[PDB]
Amino acid sequence: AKRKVEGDLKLTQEAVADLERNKKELEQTIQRKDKEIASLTAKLEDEQ
Amino acid sequence: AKRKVEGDLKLTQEAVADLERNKKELEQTIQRKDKEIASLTAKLEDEQ
Numbered sequence: 001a002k003r004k005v006e007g008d009l010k011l012t013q014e015a016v017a018d019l020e021r022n023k024k025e026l027e028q029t030i031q032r033k034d035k036e037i038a039s040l041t042a043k044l045e046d047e048q
Numbered sequence: 049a050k051r052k053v054e055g056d057l058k059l060t061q062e063a064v065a066d067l068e069r070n071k072k073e074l075e076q077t078i079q080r081k082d083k084e085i086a087s088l089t090a091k092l093e094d095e096q
Contacts, residue, residue, distance in 0.1 A: 002050035009057045012064050019067040026074050033081050040085070044092050 005054050005057060009060060012057065012060050016064050019064060022071055029078055033085060036085060040088055040092060044088060047092060047096060
């Protein structure tokens, strides 16, 4: 049994490294959509 | 040796779930911003 518990822990850890892979593939979208509105919501009121 | 590792899974599962609860809000803020940028590209073009 201890083996099963350890296996579950390993699987949960696998989910977390991947959860680093999610959180950095998403934070790039945070910065990219930040610079787009910093381009657009600057230029929209100017073209207003 | 089994006993302390059983608690370590309880530690690591919620730390996974905390990022997994941070996973859905991080999509949610992008889903909050997925719509307006595709909207303002029309609005900037309609005013232009």
